[PDB]
């Protein structure tokens, strides 16, 4: 579908059997969620954003359903005021910016 | 323009007679630049991002040309690792997300 930007670009997702809302964020290179549980090993990682850096866990090859589309990718879990779907996963559902 | 997301969605803009590049960022409600000079009065403002808060100057009704389109809006100036064009200006150039 097409989404205008008068309101935050929120989409419902299913990840690790949990349901969450996340922002389709073209300004984010990666995908990050606050408080969700993922299984398996992970690698520590620090991502930078506006306001500073945050230490997160990096989980690879994680299945995630974005607004109905089933894809798999790297997902970060760590402190964030909003769950974000980055470009790493937006390219998988074929999302584009248009004007 | 349609823009895919395999690479950062950068656009060249002109604001206050200065040229710079900025990220089309659907995850940002506001527009912020670091390292630019704007004229007139402004109001202090705390902005929250992924890594914490940043103190910035808020300038209203500032003309800005984004990828050739001339619009006007609120622009923040303060510490940021990347210039960002938020939803407040993307709606003015009719930018939409599609998938
Ligand atoms: C991978 C990771 C997710 C850490 N990336 C980012 O946070 C990038 C960082 N770059 C920079 C970078 C840093 C390090 C290395 N390369 C690049 C600048 C742009 N952000 C993307 C932003 O869109 C993220 C949002 C997150 C958010 C949404 C809603 C509520 C809270 C947090 C963001 O920063 N939003 C805020 C925001 C942002 C700009 C202007 C106004 C406002 C207000 C608000 O919407």
Swiss-Prot record, chains A, B:
**Domain of life per record:** Viruses
Residues of the Peptidase A2 domain: 20-89
Q: Where is this region: Dimerization of protease?
A: 1-5, 49-55, 88-99
Where is the catalytic site?
A: 25
Subunit structure of this chain's protein: Homodimer, whose active site consists of two apposed aspartic acid residues.
Query: What name does the UniProt record give this protein?
Result: Protease
Q: Which organism is it from?
A: Human immunodeficiency virus type 1 group M subtype B (isolate BRU/LAI)
Taxonomic lineage:
Viruses, Riboviria, Pararnavirae, Artverviricota, Revtraviricetes
Q: Which gene carries the instructions for this protein?
A: gag-pol
């Amino acid at each position: 579908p097409q989404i205008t930007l008068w309101q935050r670009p929120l989409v419902t997702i299913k990840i690790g059997g949990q349901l969450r809302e996340a922002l389709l964020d073209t300004g984010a290179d990666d995908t990050i969620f606050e408080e969700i549980s993922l299984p398996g090993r992970w690698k520590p990682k620090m991502i930078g954003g506006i306001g500073g850096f945050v230490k997160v866990r990096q989980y690879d090859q994680i299945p995630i359903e974005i607004c109905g589309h089933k894809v798999i990718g790297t997902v970060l879990v760590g402190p964030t005021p909003a769950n974000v779907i980055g470009r790493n996963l937006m390219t998988q559902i074929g999302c584009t910016l248009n004007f």
